[PDB]
Design a protein around this ligand. Structure first.
Ligand SMILES: CO[C@H]1[C@@H](O)[C@H](O)[C@H](OC[C@@]23C[C@@H]4[C@H](C)CC[C@H]4[C@@]4(C=O)C[C@@H]2CC(C(C)C)[C@@]34C(=O)O)O[C@@H]1C
Length: 819
């Protein structure tokens, strides 16, 4: 219970402030531990409400304790800002926003489960912010009760957990910071049970036994952890787990810390009415009043709370080990400032200078009961913010010279953010956390308030600007198509970063900058833009049907009439020729003579074959060709249109699963026709050529080609490794690595391997990589398209079922008409 003056006074001694948060999965006792801190040291003031965003704690340390702080200190009082944090992590930018206003973190890990992925993810982001961690291994009660673990197994579990945490810390912490790893013997690891209400540090026991052993606690805390053994028989401390005779010695941690706790649990839970009193009296635990009548769990909870109040263990680590803003801003200043390292504002941040020009970072907007009004939440890194102070509001795009995102207004009121309540205060100096009212409209989400025209913007969130997240959108009710199509246009007009287009497989595609952006776009589409039910799904990928070699034997097919026959063979068109056709070097309408010369002289074709191409397909211009190689066919000219038409048909619909053919060359070897045109009409020859083409194709070692993206990723050096890791899991192929900006990695990524790519990429790069993708080329899959179990076969089988086709692919024999 403090007055505003008392708060303001506490806020003046920034050396004695601790800005931090709790990094913990909700299921690991996050709430219970924070509640414990609040109940023990929460600060309350001596008709609006907001969403609780931060809580203020007050803690006092003894004169001797304060001397242990390896940091500038002034007095024995401390103000601790416990900043609320989401948790939902896969490396979200929101989390990074809350972390940004903190300098230290209390990391909660589970005794049994250890370090979960979420916690690892948030810790990594925290380390990326140069935040110093302190750890609490929670839920010890579970190991004692459920698993009935032994003292040594518990110790080993603790040791493994501490190691897992330090692996992460040693991997992501900046070298300039020195050793940021956590050490039980140094008092930076606590152990306890949030729900139960107890916890301890080695320092607390070292303090509790230093005088009893007649040694200074510095020596005691080193002896109460790790390989230190006190042999009662020799009265000596050693680092050997066996005595002279080779007999096993019990670890000091187990002997002096775990044993007392184990015996309390055992004695109390087993209702040992006579032992309990002795044990309590020996540990100087005094029960008062009705507590003396308690038994079992109820008694245990009461005994442990008096024995090792959890909050006390946590506050100790926060005060003695987490940095103050003064300490932290010295090495965080540069990261936080996008401007010159030797700039006046940067220097003011480095020195946490309250007299300098204002540098206040708005971390987020907090919802209030003030009719739709939100209060800005953030931290004063330099200067002092004041009520009715002219300030410069700079958005995520504001740049010194250009007036983009600039907003010069007078701060209506500065308020302390005490849980769900606010308390107006005249001003707030550098180093503190604070809330601002009246900043609503001028800013939304992150921002920066400065009182310097030269003031640059504090580190802004980098955001994707490419429509890399894409999905297929279809109406649930056919009749609504007109509304969807219209909606897409409306959506596009209202949003510059959204992309909509028709896919090669006839699907309406909606693409956004990121998952969240795409999600907003799809919601507004279904609800407003189109205002009709929609079905969202992973876009269907288009494939191409090709041949790996020449037909193993002449393909023969006859017309329904049975009077006409076509003999042909299919073979591959070289990639460079297909590309030449697709890109306009070799064209359907070019003079057949000049075109033949190019194909022969430049692409190695036989000039006669080239001069005799009957057509390109599909659509008369695709990268597939029919070459006449017949010799003495009397009515050849009369079946040409029919042969061409059939090819347009076959190349549009391949025999593997109906996809378009690509790079297929068909050579008409011979044709036998009935003398009378009456039996040689299109209705007879078209079916014949189509049937023979499919046969030739199937006989030519059929293959399917998949679409491949050219992916370009910008990112910091130490994150490049993530790119390669993900690419290797998705048949990616690095193309290049170029660069004093960032790194740009280019690679090939199969389109059917890109769904969700964006998500796994940020996961492997700690949300530091930005992907861009554009269709690049077709790639032939080597596996057998006709084998349902191969890679290509799996794709083919799935598409066939999706189209209601018979699962098995009709073989070449199905189209072959023996003589
Ligand atoms: C500028 O934005 C670009 C990029 O996002 C990318 O190049 C994208 O690629 C779309 C596809 C383009 C391919 C060519 C037209 C032929 C094969 C087509 C694809 C089919 O599998 C591969 C990619 C991904 C697609 C399906 C899955 C949608 C394509 C399609 O549009 O169907 O196109 C948009 C317009």
């Amino acid at each position: 219970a403090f007055t505003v003056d008392q708060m303001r006074s506490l806020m003046d001694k920034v050396t004695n402030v601790r800005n931090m948060s709790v990094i913990a999965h909700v299921d690991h006792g996050k709430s219970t531990l924070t509640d414990s801190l609040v109940q023990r040291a929460g600060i309350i003031s001596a008709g609006i409400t907001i969403k609780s965003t931060a809580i203020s704690l007050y803690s006092e340390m003894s004169d001797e304790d304060v001397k242990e702080i390896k940091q500038k200190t002034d007095g024995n009082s401390f103000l601790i800002n416990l900043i609320d944090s989401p948790g939902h992590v896969d490396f979200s930018s929101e989390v990074t926003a809350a972390l940004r206003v903190t300098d230290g973190a209390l990391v909660v890990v589970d005794t049994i489960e250890g370090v979960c992925v979420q916690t690892e993810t948030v810790l990594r982001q925290a380390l990326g912010e140069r935040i110093k961690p302190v750890v609490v291994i929670n839920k010890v009660d579970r190991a004692l009760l459920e698993l009935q673990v032994s003292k040594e197994d518990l110790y080993q579990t603790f040791a493994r957990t501490v190691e897992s945490v330090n692996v992460i810390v040693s991997t992501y912490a900046d070298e300039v910071l020195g050793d940021v790893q956590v050490y039980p013997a140094r008092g930076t690891v606590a152990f306890g049970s949030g729900l139960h209400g107890w916890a301890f540090t080695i320092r607390q026991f070292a303090t509790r036994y230093a005088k009893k052993f007649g040694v200074d606690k510095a020596k005691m805390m080193d002896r109460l952890w790790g390989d230190s053994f006190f042999n009662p028989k020799t009265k000596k401390w050693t680092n050997k787990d066996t005595d002279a005779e080779g007999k096993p010695l019990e670890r000091a941690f187990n002997m002096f810390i775990l044993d007392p706790i184990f015996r309390l649990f055992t004695a109390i839970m087993n209702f040992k009415k006579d032992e309990i009193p002795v044990l309590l009296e020996k540990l100087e635990i005094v029960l008062k009043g009705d507590e003396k009548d308690l038994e079992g769990k109820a008694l245990l909870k009461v005994v442990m709370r008096k024995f090792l109040p959890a909050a006390d263990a946590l506050l100790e680590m926060i005060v003695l080990h987490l940095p103050s803003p003064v300490t932290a801003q010295a090495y965080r200043a540069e990261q936080l400032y996008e401007g010159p390292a030797d700039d006046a504002n940067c220097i003011a941040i480095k020195n946490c200078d309250p007299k300098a020009d204002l540098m206040l970072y708005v971390s987020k907007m907090v919802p209030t009961s003030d009719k739709g009004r939100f209060y800005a939440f953030g931290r004063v890194f330099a200067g002092t913010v004041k009520s009715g102070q002219k300030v410069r509001i700079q958005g995520p795009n504001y740049v010194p010279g250009k007036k983009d995102d600039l907003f010069i207004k007078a701060i209506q009121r500065v308020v302390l953010m005490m849980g769900r309540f606010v308390e107006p205060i005249d001003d707030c100096p550098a180093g503190n956390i604070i809330g601002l009212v009246g900043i609503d409209q001028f800013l939304l989400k992150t921002g920066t308030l400065t009182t310097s025209e030269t003031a640059h913007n504090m580190k802004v969130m980098k955001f994707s600007v490419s429509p890399v997240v894409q999905v297929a959108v279809e109406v649930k009710n056919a009749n609504d198509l007109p509304k969807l199509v219209e909606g897409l246009k409306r959506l596009s007009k209202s949003d510059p970063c959204v992309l909509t287009y028709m896919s090669e497989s006839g699907e309406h595609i909606v693409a956004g900058t990121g998952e969240l952006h795409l999600e907003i776009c799809l919601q507004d589409l279904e609800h407003d833009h189109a205002g009709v039910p929609l079905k969202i799904s992973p876009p269907v990928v288009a494939y191409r049907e090709t041949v790996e070699s020449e037909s193993s034997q002449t393909a023969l097919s006859k017309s329904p009439n049975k009077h006409n026959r076509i003999y042909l063979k299919a073979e591959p068109i070289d990639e460079e020729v297909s590309l030449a056709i697709e890109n306009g070097i070799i064209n359907p309408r070019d003079d057949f003579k000049a075109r033949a010369r190019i194909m022969a002289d430049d692409y190695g074709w036989d000039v006669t074959d080239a001069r005799k191409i009957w057509c390109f397909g599909p659509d008369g211009n695709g990268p597939n060709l029919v070459i006449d190689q017949t010799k003495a066919v009397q009515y050849l000219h009369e079946i040409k249109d029919s042969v061409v038409a059939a090819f347009q048909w076959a190349t549009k619909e391949g025999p593997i699963f109906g996809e378009e053919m690509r790079s297929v060359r068909v050579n008409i070897l011979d044709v036998t026709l009935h003398a009378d045109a009456i039996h040689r009409g299109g209705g007879q020859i078209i079916p014949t050529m189509r049937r023979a083409t499919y046969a030739g194709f199937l006989l030519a070692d059929p293959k399917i080609q998949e679409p491949v993206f050219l992916v370009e990723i910008q990112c910091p050096e130490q994150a490049v490794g993530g790119i390669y890791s993900v690419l290797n899991k998705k048949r990616g192929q690095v193309v290049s690595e170029e660069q004093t900006p960032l790194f740009t990695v280019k690679a090939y990524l199969p389109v059917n391997e890109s769904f969700g790519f964006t998500g796994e990429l940020r996961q492997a790069t700690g949300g530091q990589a930005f992907p861009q993708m554009v269709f690049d080329h077709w790639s032939t899959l080597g596996s057998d398209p006709l084998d349902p179990t191969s890679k290509a076969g799996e794709i083919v089988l799935a598409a066939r079922k999706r189209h209601g086709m018979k699962e098995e692919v009709p073989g070449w024999q199905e189209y072959y008409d023996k003589l």
